[PDB]
């Protein structure tokens, strides 16, 4: 639930 354009995710 982090946008597709965001460079970083988190898991």
């Amino acid at each position, epitope marked *: *639930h*982090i*946008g597709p*354009g965001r*460079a*970083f995710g988190g898991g």
Partner: antibody
Amino acid sequence: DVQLQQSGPDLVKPSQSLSLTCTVTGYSITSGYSWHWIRQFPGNKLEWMGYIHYSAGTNYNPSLKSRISITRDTSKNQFFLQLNSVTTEDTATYYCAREEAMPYGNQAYYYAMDCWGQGTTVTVSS
Amino acid sequence: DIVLTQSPASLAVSLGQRATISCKASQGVDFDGASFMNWYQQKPGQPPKLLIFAASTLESGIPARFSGRGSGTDFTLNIHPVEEEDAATYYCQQSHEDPLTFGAGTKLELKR
């Protein structure tokens, strides 16, 4: 509680470097998903500046890419922003912010910018 | 980039009325069943404060008087009923992609 505090100069001569500091009290920068920097020019126009992931990595707004740099300090628990070759168009109010997991839906998170500092007014002039 | 065109810039609503701020986007902003739009309200001399996020999920501490909706390229925020401690500037904002961007905002002035 949990609070961020922008600290830094009020007046920077053009062609120098802007080095602002955001002191995070009551939360380890490590516990953060990501810490951002945003500035707001006269007229209230807002501009996202860049951020630093909990993995120490970064991402910057292209329009500034060439001259911006965001770093952090685990021990003092504050992250910094440095901006090179400052011109008069760099006069605005700067704010550091936090992005965190927000409970969206059922047992699901969603990251957003929820806590912001007071903002510090930076004047670029001779 | 993704541009956020908010409407309108100026909005005047007398007490106990209904405030309706739109906010269109250049590209759609949904993904994996979530819509990456958010809203902040800024009062003069204050940092922007997060109201709703993900289009409709209202942030705790915020009166259920505020409402968020829309999907794709169109979104919206409504106040029912408009209070005095509601005069501010509202900004929609997308977390769909980096670089993140903001709208121009909407000065909400209360009629008297």
